[PDB]
């Protein structure tokens, strides 16, 4: 059922935005059609975990007239599309930054035959413009509007800061200087767990975990009823683990199941696998990694992969996952004490995360 | 005087932004330094025409206490001025990438800096926009005008992004515009019309360059409704169109040494004022020569397009266009003057920075 109201609201949103462009922005039906295709290609096709979480948190909190339920759940649906549109935006631009080929078993937006890279960049930011435009339209008379926008913008900013951490992680930050060219790091001295945890906290955790929970609480008018200290701890922990999962799958999960080809090795990313391998590797193994990392050459890539399985990384992953589950279980119970319906929805979100195959 | 106060506020904004990153966002000193340099390079060094207009509008409406209002209003105007300046910074970073440009204000484009990767350039460009919101939320947190300011600022930003879509798809036959299918640059240029030019330009330039600074100056001085907005918008659209026509003409005919940027319109096959004006008046023979030479990087092909423009007396058309604009502007400024004398004067001042600019 939630998927049904969600997809009805997508149409509501799509119609408001495309008709506004027709009527107030002088747009021709040729471009309206292009934008319609763009929206559908970029915003649909996923599992909508972020947006569906907003709905579930809302449905979990309606208690702590059936008109209110209808209004609150519609508000949640709009909020859910705001995060789905935001991630739509993030992924269009990220695929460009990461030189990716496919996404959900289709070409990346910028990789479509009639999308130029310069138009893809612009399309990507229109997606983010729509997130604000939809909020202002659907929530114009809602008192939570200001708080919602403020929190949403902070999270977006947080994510762009994390993207900076990601995209500059393979350059020696002491040598960071607009005026001087610098090659990829050769010593990898910054590929540390502490540095990994920072990239992933900022670029993933806030928008993937905190934001949906927070938006769910806002449309419920229930925010100040939860322990926000514990909520953020939980969001940071699940968010980190989610990105470790993403990083592991990038290397080890068949692209046909993932829907996308991995680029982290080629792009010389500070992944979970890279940091954890380098922390434990022999000098000999580090030498071979350095000789093979961050190149498109397919044997070099397979070398890195071999090194990873040689150093029992999957063993380290299982142990990390159990340590995470342990901490997540504890925090949910701390949450259960004063917010049992909210704690229930966090458990459901955790259930969508723990040991996902995707 | 305005530049003095304006630059003090720049320091104030920079400090807030970069300290917040260090204190709240776990940012290391190396990246705080990169971001400071990125901010200075992208935001400083221009004419600050947009930002200085906000201050001027506000210092003009400071007619309609102990001196406290004035200090507050002028500071707010300075912050809004930097909001547009940062927004313009954001547009130029991303536009130079999109336009395959090489220099900007006589230095390399941001994405052309030796130690800036294109992927970082894209993100750096976006941080600049994020900063416009963050500076507004901090400095204006207790102002009643906050929501209105943010609503209008955002509407203008979105307008500008729509204009950029118009600009970037102008060389493609829109009937064949299709994500799934590759298409070359147009060969008939049937959409290179003045009607299509006027829309590209209204959206990508006039709203953020002309309307927005005027509106923000009115907001911080709390004078927004005191003004005929139909006339004001008319003015901004006319002035903004002219400015872009000027930008387009300079792209072709002003030495990069005075421009501070190397022109890319011919090479990028842009629906420029020159191209649409030429195509409307040109003989069949001239048109066929243009078609053979437009949208190519080859230095011989671009020189042909310059020659065809000279041959067709486009400098003659421009002078008459400019004269026609100047007349309508003066008429509209007088309509404003009746009930809005202070604001009309600031609009006259903005016109003065625009008309026959040597930029
Ligand atoms: C102009 C746009 C500015 C950039 C905005 C921030 C982009 C944040 O993009 C993100 C954040 C988290 C995950 N992802 C996608 C992930 P993937 O789906 O594996 O490509 P990854 O980190 O591994 O690349 C993209
Ligand atoms: C990721 C955000 C990118 C899209 C945001 C909209 C960009 C609009 O940029 C604009 C709008 C108007 C003039 N300019 C610069 C002009 P120039 O300074 O001559 O390069 P032109 O139109 O000829 O390129 C840039
Ligand atoms: Mg990616
Ligand atoms: Mg990435
Ligand atoms: Mg990945
Ligand atoms: Mg451009
Ligand atoms: Mg340009
Ligand atoms: Mg130009």
Q: Could you say which ligand is closest to the alpha carbon of residue B122?
A: 1
**Ligand 2 atom, smallest distance to B160 CA:** 6
User: Do residues A89 and A124 touch, judged by C-beta distance below 8 A?
Assistant: yes
Contact A167 B120 (CB under 8 A): yes
User: CB of A184 within 8 Å of any CB in chain B?
Assistant: no
From A93, A122, A156, residue closest to B164, measured CB to CB? A122
Quickly tell me which residue has 């949103």 as its tokens. A13
Chain B environment of A182 (Cβ under 8 Å)? 115
> Which pairing describes strands B107-108 and A106-107: parallel, antiparallel, or unpaired?
unpaired
User: How many domains, in total, are found in chain B?
Assistant: 1
CA-based nearest distance B205→chain A, Å:
14
Q: Calculate ∠ Cα B20-A213-A330, nearest 5°.
A: 95
- Bridge partners of B242, per DSSP, are none
Per the CB < 8 A criterion, the answer to whether B130 and A157 are in contact is: yes
- Among the partner-chain residues A133, A163, A173, the one whose CB lies closest to the CB of B30 is A173
Rounded Cα distance, B12 and A220, in Å: 38
Residue B325: CB atoms within 10 Å: 20
Instruction: Go through chain B and tell me how many residues it has.
Output: 359
- Would the CB atoms of B120 and A26 count as touching at under 8 Å? no
Give me the residues of B, 201-260, that contact A with CB < 8 A: 202-203
Full 3-state SS string of chain A: CHHHHHHHHHHHHHHHHHHHHHHHCCCCHHHHHHHHHHHHHHHCCCCCHHHHHHHHHHHHHCCCCHHHHHHHHHHHHHHHHHHHHHHHHHHHHHHHHHCCCEECCEECHHHCCCCCHHHHHHHHHHHHHHHHHHHHHHCCCCCCHHHHHHHHHHHHHHHHHHHHHHHCCCCCHHHCCCCCCCCCCCCCCCCCHHHHHHHHHHHHHHHHHHHHHHHHHHHCCCHHHCCHHHHHHHHHHHHHHHHHHHHHHHHHCCHHHHCCCCCCCCCCCCCHHHHHHHHHCCHHHHHHHHHHCCCCCHHHHHHHHHHHHHCCHHHHHHHHHHHHHHHHHHHHHHHHCCCHHHHHHHHHHHHCCCCCCC
Q: Is A174 on the interface with B (CB under 8 A)?
A: yes
Assess B158–A contact: CB distance below 8 Å, yes or no: yes
Q: Which residues, including other chains, have CB under 8 Å from residue A253's CB and lie 6 or more apart?
A: A358
**Interface check A300 vs B, CB under 8 A:** no
Measure Cα distances from A87 to A39, B175, B224, B302 in Å: 12, 30, 36, 41
Q: Which of A21, A164, A181 sits opposite B115 (nearest CB)?
A: A181
CB crowding A129-142: b at 16 or more within 10 Å, else e: bbbbbbbeebbeeb
Take atom 5 of ligand 2 and give the residue whose Cα is closest.
Answer: B161
Among B86, B89, B91, say which to mutate for ligand 2: greatest number of ligand atoms within 8 Å of CB.
Answer: B91
Number of Cβ atoms within 10 Å of the Cβ of B190: 12
Q: Which residues of A touch B169 (CB under 8 A)?
A: 31, 34, 119
Residue from B24, B96, B166, B179 to probe the interface with A (highest A Cβ count within 10 Å): B179
Q: How far is CA A209 from the centre of its chain?
A: 9
Contact A294, A324 (CB under 8 A): no
Q: How many residues does chain A have?
A: 358
- The residue of chain A with its CA nearest to that of B94 is A121
Q: Quick one: which of A19, A9, A16 has its CA closest to A75? A: A9
DSSP assigned state of B355? T
Scanning the structure block, which residue is given the tokens 């001027």? B56
B103: part of which helix (H) or strand (E)? Answer: strand B103-104
Q: Is A143 on the interface with B (CB under 8 A)?
A: no
Q: How far is the CA of B353 from the centre of ligand 8 (A)?
A: 18
Ligand 8 (ion): residues with CB under 5 Å are B 247, 251
Cα distance between residue A278 and residue A193, in whole Å: 10
Tokens 């404003």, residue? B336
Ligand 5 geometric centre to CA of A301 (Å): 16
How many contacts does A have with B, using Cβ atoms within 8 A?
151
Distances (CA, A) of A353 to A163, A209, A346, A347, A349: 22, 10, 11, 10, 7
Give backbone dihedrals phi and psi of A107, rounded to 5 degrees, phi first.
-55, 150
Technique used by the depositors: X-ray
d(CA B270, CA A353): 48
What are the backbone angles phi and psi of residue A86, rounded to the nearest 5°? -55, -50
- Name the residue facing A121 among B122, B137, B169 (closest C-beta): B122
The residue range of the domain holding B228 is 1-359
CA angle, residues B140, B145, B149, in degrees to nearest 5:
85
Do residues B305 and B293 make contact, with C-beta atoms less than 8 angstroms apart? yes
Ligand 2 atom closest to the Cα of residue A124 is 1
Inter-axis angle of helices A66-98 and A49-61, nearest 10: 160
Cα-based distances in Å from B209 to A57, A234, A300, B86:
43, 45, 51, 12
H or E, element range at B276: helix B273-281
Between positions 31 and 70 of B, the ones with CB within 8 A of A are 31, 33-34, 37-38, 41
The resolution, in angstroms to one decimal, equals: 2.0
B181 shares contact with chain A (CB less than 8 Å): yes
Tell me if residue B294 falls in helix, strand or coil.
coil
Q: Measuring CA to CA, which residue among A166, A194, A189, A198 is closest to residue A267?
A: A166
Three-class SS state of B104: strand
Dist CA A162 CA A270 (whole Å): 12
B337 contacts: CB under 8 Å, gap ≥ 6? B344
What distance in Å separates residue A283's CA from the closest CA in chain B? 28
CATH number at residue A91: 1.10.600.10
Residue A358 to residue A95: CA distance in whole angstroms: 18
């Amino acid at each position: 059922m939630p998927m049904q109201m969600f997809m009805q609201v997508y149409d509501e949103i799509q119609m408001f935005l495309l008709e506004e462009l027709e009527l107030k922005f002088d747009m021709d039906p040729n471009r309206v059609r292009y934008l319609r295709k763009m929206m559908d290609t970029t915003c649909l096709g996923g599992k909508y975990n972020r947006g569906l979480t907003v709905i579930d948190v809302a449905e979990s909190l309606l208690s702590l007239d059936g008109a209110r339920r209808k209004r609150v759940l519609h508000d949640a649906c709009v909020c859910g599309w705001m995060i789905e549109f935001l991630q739509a935006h993030y992924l269009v631009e990220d695929d460009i930054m990461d030189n990716s080929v496919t996404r959900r078993g289709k070409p990346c937006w910028y990789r479509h035959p009639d999308v130029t890279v310069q138009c893809a960049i612009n399309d990507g930011l229109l997606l983010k413009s729509w997130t604000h435009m939809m909020a202002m339209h659907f929530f114009a008379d809602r008192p939570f509007l200001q708080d919602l926008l403020c929190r949403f913008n902070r999270v977006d900013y947080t994510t762009a800061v994390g993207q900076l951490y990601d995209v500059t992680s393979m350059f020696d930050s002491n040598k960071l200087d607009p005026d001087v060219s610098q090659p990829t790091t050769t010593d990898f001295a910054e590929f540390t767990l502490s540095n990994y945890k920072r990239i992933v906290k900022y670029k993933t955790a806030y928008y993937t975990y905190l934001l949906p929970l927070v938006m769910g609480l806002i449309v419920s008018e229930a925010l100040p009823t939860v322990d926000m200290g514990v909520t953020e701890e939980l969001a940071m922990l699940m968010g980190e683990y989610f990105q470790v999962q993403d990083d592991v799958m990038d290397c080890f999960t068949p692209p046909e199941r993932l829907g996308k080809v991995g680029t982290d090795i080629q792009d010389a990313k500070c992944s979970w696998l890279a940091v954890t391998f380098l922390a434990k590797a022999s000098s000999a193994q580090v030498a071979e990694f350095k000789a093979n990392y961050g190149s498109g050459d397919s044997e070099k890539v397979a070398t890195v992969r071999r090194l990873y399985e040689e150093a029992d990384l999957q063993g380290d992953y299982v142990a990390y996952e159990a340590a995470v589950a342990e901490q997540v279980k504890e925090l949910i119970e701390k949450l259960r004490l004063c917010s049992p319906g909210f704690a229930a929805s966090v458990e459901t979100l955790w259930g969508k995360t723990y040991k996902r195959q995707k």
